[PDB]
Write a protein that binds this ligand. Sequence first.
Ligand SMILES: Nc1ncnc2c1ncn2[C@@H]1O[C@H](COP(=O)(O)OP(=O)(O)OP(=O)(O)O)[C@@H](O)[C@H]1O
Ligand SMILES: Nc1ncnc2c1ncn2[C@@H]1O[C@H](COP(=O)(O)OP(=O)(O)OP(=O)(O)O)[C@@H](O)[C@H]1O
Ligand SMILES: [K+]
Ligand SMILES: [K+]
Lengths: 555, 561
Amino acid sequence: KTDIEIAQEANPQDIRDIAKKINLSEDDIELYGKYKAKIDYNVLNRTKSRAGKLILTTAINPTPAGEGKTTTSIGVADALAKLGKNVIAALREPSMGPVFGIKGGAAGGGYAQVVPMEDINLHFTGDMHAIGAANNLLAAMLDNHVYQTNSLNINPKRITWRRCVDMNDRQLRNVVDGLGKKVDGVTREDGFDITVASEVMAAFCLSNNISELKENLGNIVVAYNYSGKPVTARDLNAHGAMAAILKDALKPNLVQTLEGTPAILHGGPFANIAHGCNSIIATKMGMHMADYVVTEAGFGADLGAEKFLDIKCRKAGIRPDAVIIVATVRALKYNGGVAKDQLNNENLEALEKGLPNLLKHIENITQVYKIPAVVAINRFPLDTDAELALVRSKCEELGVKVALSEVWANGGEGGIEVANEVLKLIEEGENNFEYCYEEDMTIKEKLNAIATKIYGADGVNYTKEANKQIAELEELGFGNLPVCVAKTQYSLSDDQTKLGRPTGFTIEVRQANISAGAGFVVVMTGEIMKMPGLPKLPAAERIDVDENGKISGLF
Amino acid sequence: SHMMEFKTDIEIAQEANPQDIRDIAKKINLSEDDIELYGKYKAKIDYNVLNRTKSRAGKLILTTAINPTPAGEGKTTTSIGVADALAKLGKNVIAALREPSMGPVFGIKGGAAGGGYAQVVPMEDINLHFTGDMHAIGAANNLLAAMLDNHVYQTNSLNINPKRITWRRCVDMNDRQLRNVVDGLGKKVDGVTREDGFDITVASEVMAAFCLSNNISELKENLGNIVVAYNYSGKPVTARDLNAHGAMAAILKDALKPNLVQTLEGTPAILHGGPFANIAHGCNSIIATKMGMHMADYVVTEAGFGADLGAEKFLDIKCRKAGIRPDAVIIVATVRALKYNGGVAKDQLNNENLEALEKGLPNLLKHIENITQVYKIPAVVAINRFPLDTDAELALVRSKCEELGVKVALSEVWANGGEGGIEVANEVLKLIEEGENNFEYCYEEDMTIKEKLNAIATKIYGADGVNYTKEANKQIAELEELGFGNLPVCVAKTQYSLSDDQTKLGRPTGFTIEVRQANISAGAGFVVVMTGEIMKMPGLPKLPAAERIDVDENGKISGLF
Ligand SMILES: Nc1ncnc2c1ncn2[C@@H]1O[C@H](COP(=O)(O)OP(=O)(O)OP(=O)(O)O)[C@@H](O)[C@H]1O
Ligand SMILES: Nc1ncnc2c1ncn2[C@@H]1O[C@H](COP(=O)(O)OP(=O)(O)OP(=O)(O)O)[C@@H](O)[C@H]1O
Ligand SMILES: [K+]
Ligand SMILES: [K+]
């Protein structure tokens, strides 16, 4: 059975019945049909919390296919519901753009999904459109100020703010606008990002309430003046209207899994130029309404988990009680020199040389951040017991239990082995959580702390332009913020070919930007694509609608 | 006529007690299985209800007005007032109106759906994202542009000439910066360099085809007929050639369901669509008007601008493609507007001027002759009364209008609400039950483009002929050779006058309209004709209204209106 067939034959409950499972009245939610609803964030102010625990699901350095990190979160959440616990699965919302290029995807996979799958891949509750409308209003007010008076003395060559659209349109990567008559604006270079790559999205996810959201949108640096000083959205008096555009969008979206477990999908920025987690207000909503929250971070534990802990948790004042490290025997054998085609041969030798990658993420989670961790093995069909005994053998050496996950084929029943081990880590495991770095350090000291402790590098090298940018950010006062390293996800290093666990390498930083709205410094290692393109035969050509309004060709 | 205890539109809207939308749905025999809730005050009506219920064959009431003036007319408030009035009279009625775009909200100000005590609520949501119809229009518009540029970049096997790409992107913002752009810059993997531009989302042809589709099947067909470019041979390239109309209809699947809201008095109100009244027809969607006529006994809808533009496009475009016929027409006018057509300045409009009232009255009399003697529809003049309107002024309008065989009913819906439109509504009930309807189109399909433009300019506008530029004569002929000569025409001229001249007020006579360009909207199904330059993308003022909008610690928005 395909993922689209499992979702259709599933019987989803009325979302008002899902809300009763977390003690939410019908005056506390706003329906979007029978199967979707938004939760008023003011419930956080008139009801007391349940002080729920936080479960973070990460994974080893990924292969182009994946390791089932999202299916593991949904399956473990369903498993904890099978154990009688009150649980919410906090996940990200996909973007609509890639649906029309490489076709859509299920919120999860197999029997560990989130439903309705069709609305999630499309407009959902309109959160993407709200993000893009606030992004494009600030850009329209920025160009309007330069056209009317430019009393802020903005240099058009130094405008870093970019418009956005929820489409895979390579045509809009590099743009000249403001052409035509003198009443048609100020001519300058510009461009479009995909909406999820916008800084509005990152500040949307790193806001604890509506008051902090408006303050963060005001801190957004949109350009620089001719004197070199930053110009903020607050200087343009735009953050008040931007917060109004995002007023309803900031309300988390309540949905359900295939087994009726309450699910919350909210936000979803990049995991390279941003932190790649769901919104703070959705995570803290789950911890307010449930006893256990299963969330995740994009890419491997060297990026998403590092940014979940050093950026999201630092701004939310929260802390994970357990970490689930997802790993597959295919990915470890892929790290052991095996190609994608030969991933099915029982190669115990290549599994051992790809294991240091899994063991490195185990050391980062358990010894650097000091959080109890458990290795969840996403059992792909052809795994052998000798393969599963070797990965269980060397994970015992550093004091981490290994549970076998079968949530893709069995749903919640397949995650009981992982669920129980997480519940025991919350009871047993001591928690001495420490950040990878402190705020007082400079930008270069924070990057060196991440590169040596987490990545395993000897140090960080900076180009001539990066040194100029880092120093200018220090002079402007942005040296007290966290740093967001944008590098490849397929490797611990910045070289996407160095698989396994690289040894004597150094990170080369070539560009640094400021995301003062989200509250971190973006540090780029290579070139990052913020607007993907459409393939030769886009999937949109196969999408159709019948006489009753049923969509075909989406999945 | 005047509000005894004056309140702004916000104070009236927030002091109002709106019913649950499921209780509004019960007033039109719609169960909770037929509606998708968007909160407790907004809902979407499944369009497959018309395939499961017997139609009530409701009556259609079009609300129009004289030419727009700087003094105001009140065509939107009159629509809500008459609908609330019919509800007070025991009638099962629905008000069908347009949805505003979010763009002008951050420019100058946000406006109530109406005003005074003739409003539609929830006001805050309608002016903002509402149920997301505008976003789906823009998504489908920009998807077509993305696949158009992708095809040209990948193979260009359709032989599209990049200089001849008419399709533009859109955004629901007032951003003059995006009027004229050049994109596709950078490396070879960054597309094909060409000139481009952005329209405001309500100006997209997708929006025009969105309102002129009877069902989702016609929508997919209309979107496929959209002409996006021309090849080097001169032949049109359509969205169907790009295999895009199926995906565009999927983006517009939920959006095609009309939105169900309510007035201040609990009357069911359907808001769906809202394009321009110059480059398009300026009406709410056909499926919304069909929905009301299927579920109600009377439907009150409106058309943008004066009767020379919106009512003409309602009858010659929308009514033609929907197969419906208006039973009664409401011509809304104010005494101060007719005195403005008489030569009185905007600051002297409050003085009683009986002679200037008769000099500007030929404007109202011209629209009456168009509704009653050209389309042959029973009409009624609804005077939006103001406190300073003397009895001599009101008696002069009633005298001159009753010569054409049309009654004049006073309207006080702004200050009194539903009971301020009883006189107008009962005058409309008399026209439907008594007067005969020999509805005729202004022209027919078989005529050439220049014959349809001549029939409109002479019968409706009062012109002696139509003059064409050299550039217009070729474009008309190119559309004739390509087989677009059997489509209605949508004249894009000024709204402030019956001519193409903004300053000739009242009733100009010895003039001629001057066509300067002619485009094709094969998706909506009409040929666009222009007498001047059109602003498809407004700009922000020096101090935009967005600087005043704020949100508090609890999520309450202020400064919006
Ligand atoms: N044990 C399994 N057997 C077979 N297929 C699986 C298994 N686990 C996951 N998958 C498939 O892999 C796909 C992607 O999984 P998932 O998205 O959870 O991984 P991910 O790491 O979150 O992906 P990404 O990192 O690309 O976001 C799903 O569609 C699912 O069907
Ligand atoms: N009789 C009246 N007295 C005072 N104010 C009125 C009256 N009628 C209408 N208005 C005001 O005029 C404003 C606009 O009226 P309305 O929208 O009905 O006019 P319109 O020109 O037909 O529509 P639009 O203004 O949207 O183009 C409303 O805000 C309303 O408050
Ligand atoms: K989405
Ligand atoms: K709107």
